[PDB]
């Protein structure tokens, strides 16, 4: 039989990871986060997927502990931020140990992502899945062109 | 005198044209606009590029009307996405006439690309610029290999 696409919209609702798969998507949702403060939320998300998937070798130490030193304080250290505020202590402190000293396993963020992760899903998510440019103006289908 | 080459880095913090022309600035950059859910800019900006090259004559004729379908119905008609919101109106009306009427010029998207490469130009080239992935990871140095 012919396929049937599940519509991007509702594969954004179906799960998180569909929603982070999708530029459209992922554009929208930042969007929506920027406007209420959260999109470090996001932005933390996606800073640490990228470097966990950097490798550790005698010629990119310095570049890995710039970047981990970047992330930590930019995200953990800020106790203005969000990040800072849904983020363990124990979890934060971990990471602060890490970069003083400068033991920085690839995987070092994984816990913080996670929790970042949790807070993402439990809340603001959830929130854009009922937030007006969702529900109203992405979720409305186009019309088709004409003349 | 012997010359002294601009580190890649810099050379892509000069122009935006400098960074596009670099394998190592467009991963850099293409990864750092899909993590905001911005990638169809680069993207678009590049199909145009390719499609422009083509020329008409009586034996390419579907292939090219094809191509140019694809690049509107994926860029420009999707609503939910960014190239939509950031080309005019008349920008798209242009393209989609162009589309319907089967007039396929070689150089119908110059004015969508133009405002595309303008947003680039003004928001995520200079966003990318300030970014972690390029100020602390890509411009620190490499360690000189031992052992």
């Given at each position: 039989?012919?396929?049937?696409?599940?519509?991007p919209?509702?594969?954004?609702?179906?799960?998180l990871?569909?929603?982070?798969?999708?530029?459209?998507?992922?554009?929208?949702?930042?969007?929506?986060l920027?406007?209420?403060?959260?999109?470090?939320?996001?932005?933390?998300?996606?800073?640490?997927?990228?470097?966990?998937?950097?490798?550790?070798?005698?010629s990119?130490?310095?570049?890995?502990?710039?970047?981990?030193?970047?992330?930590?304080?930019?995200?953990?250290?800020?106790?203005?931020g969000?990040?800072?505020?849904?983020?363990?202590?124990?979890?934060?402190?971990?990471?602060?140990?890490?970069?003083?000293?400068?033991?920085?396993?690839?995987?070092?963020?994984?816990?913080?992502?996670?929790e970042?992760?949790?807070?993402?899903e439990?809340?603001?998510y959830?929130?854009?899945?009922?937030?007006?440019?969702?529900?109203e103006?992405?979720?409305?289908?186009?019309?088709?062109?004409?003349?």
């Amino acid at each position: 039989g012919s396929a049937s696409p599940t519509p991007p919209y509702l594969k954004w609702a179906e799960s998180l990871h569909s929603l982070l798969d999708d530029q459209d998507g992922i554009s929208l949702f930042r969007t929506f986060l920027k406007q209420e403060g959260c999109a470090d939320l996001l932005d933390f998300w996606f800073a640490c997927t990228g470097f966990r998937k950097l490798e550790p070798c005698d010629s990119n130490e310095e570049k890995r502990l710039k970047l981990a030193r970047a992330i930590y304080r930019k995200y953990i250290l800020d106790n203005n931020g969000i990040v800072s505020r849904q983020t363990k202590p124990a979890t934060k402190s971990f990471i602060k140990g890490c970069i003083m000293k400068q033991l920085i396993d690839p995987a070092m963020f994984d816990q913080a992502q996670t929790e970042i992760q949790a807070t993402m899903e439990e809340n603001t998510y959830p929130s854009f899945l009922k937030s007006d440019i969702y529900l109203e103006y992405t979720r409305t289908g186009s019309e088709s062109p004409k003349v």
